[PDB]
């Protein structure tokens, strides 16, 4: 009922701010994002890696196969993996040497669940390095790979119009 | 005071959190190793860096016939 | 909050970028950064050039 929730700016204290509002926090947005890392960690990553790798994968095709350097290609290759498959490699390790910001190094192991987590204090890290690996390892097999059922597909395609 | 949609209605109520979705698509370990080389790593990643980048660059240029600049 | 590229300490700390930018552009000013002794310095310009 309350003019917008029991009317609060933030979670409650005003003072951090973020002026929590729609597009910050509406039952409708907020939800379109929790198997995914925004709030909770669904599973120990390893898997999120490829839905991340892959979805972002078959992107970067018409960007560099329809806007390519000398464009609209007559080659077997593009439509194409090509260079883009090269980008997921540069990308994916530009990605790794960031997982040298956190190492923090363990196996604990839980994608299995005890007791509704809370994480407890997930906010902030508590991702060890042996986590950020299995993500940016999922990234490679998500990038390269997610680059082929892009071109594998014939483009049945829609014409400008 | 009849009307009021007497506690109307609530939800339980206007909580949400406690089970909004079953979590994830099955795929369990349809990958698990499956491809190891980032699933193995300690230690790697040079190894790979010279490899990927050696092909990309190596065949990336040389030959067959020109097609020149 | 780590301890990091050395000769300086003053530099070696601020998180703020000044730590890199500056990192490069002391390298050459031998006299009177951390290391230096009149015997260091001299030689530290000799096997330099």
């Amino acid at each position: 009922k309350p003019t917008y929730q029991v009317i609060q700016p933030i979670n409650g204290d005003p003072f951090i701010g973020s002026l929590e509002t729609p597009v910050t926090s509406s039952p409708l947005i907020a939800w379109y994002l929790s198997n995914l890392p925004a709030y909770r960690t669904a599973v120990s990553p390893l898997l999120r890696g490829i839905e991340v790798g892959l979805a972002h994968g078959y992107l970067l095709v018409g960007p560099f196969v329809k806007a390519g350097p000398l464009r609209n290609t007559e080659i077997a290759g593009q439509a194409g993996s090509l260079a883009a498959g090269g980008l997921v490699v540069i990308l994916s390790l530009c990605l790794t040497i960031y997982g040298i910001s956190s190492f923090n190094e363990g196996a604990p192991s839980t994608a299995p669940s005890l007791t509704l987590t809370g994480r407890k204090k997930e906010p902030d890290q508590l991702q060890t390095a042996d986590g950020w690996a299995k993500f940016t390892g999922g990234f490679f097999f998500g990038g390269i790979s997610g680059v082929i059922w892009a071109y594998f597909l014939l483009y049945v395609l829609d014409l400008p119009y | 005071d009849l009307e009021d949609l007497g506690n109307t209605t609530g939800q339980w109520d206007s909580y949400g959190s406690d089970a909004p979705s079953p979590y994830n698509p099955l795929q369990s370990k349809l990958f698990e190793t499956f491809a190891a080389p980032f699933t193995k790593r300690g230690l790697l990643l040079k190894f790979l860096i010279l490899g990927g980048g050696s092909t990309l660059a190596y065949l990336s240029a040389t030959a067959s016939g020109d097609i020149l600049p | 909050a780590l301890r990091i590229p050395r000769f300086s300490q003053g530099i070696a700390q601020d998180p703020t970028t000044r730590r890199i930018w500056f990192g490069i552009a002391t390298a050459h000013d031998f006299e009177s950064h951390d290391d230096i002794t009149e015997g260091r310095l001299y030689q530290n310009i000799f096997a330099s050039h």
Binding site: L93, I100, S101 | I49, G53, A57, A61, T62, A63 | -
Partner: peptide, 30 residues
């Protein structure tokens, strides 16, 4: 084989940079 001396611009102008921009992110950490 015919006409093929194109490697000393990526190994250098491309890949050598990869090394150091990676590597030398030792300035951040190692």
């Amino acid at each position: 084989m015919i006409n093929l001396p194109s490697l000393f611009v990526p190994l250098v102008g491309l890949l050598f940079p990869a090394v150091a921009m990676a590597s030398l992110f030792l300035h951040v950490e190692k």
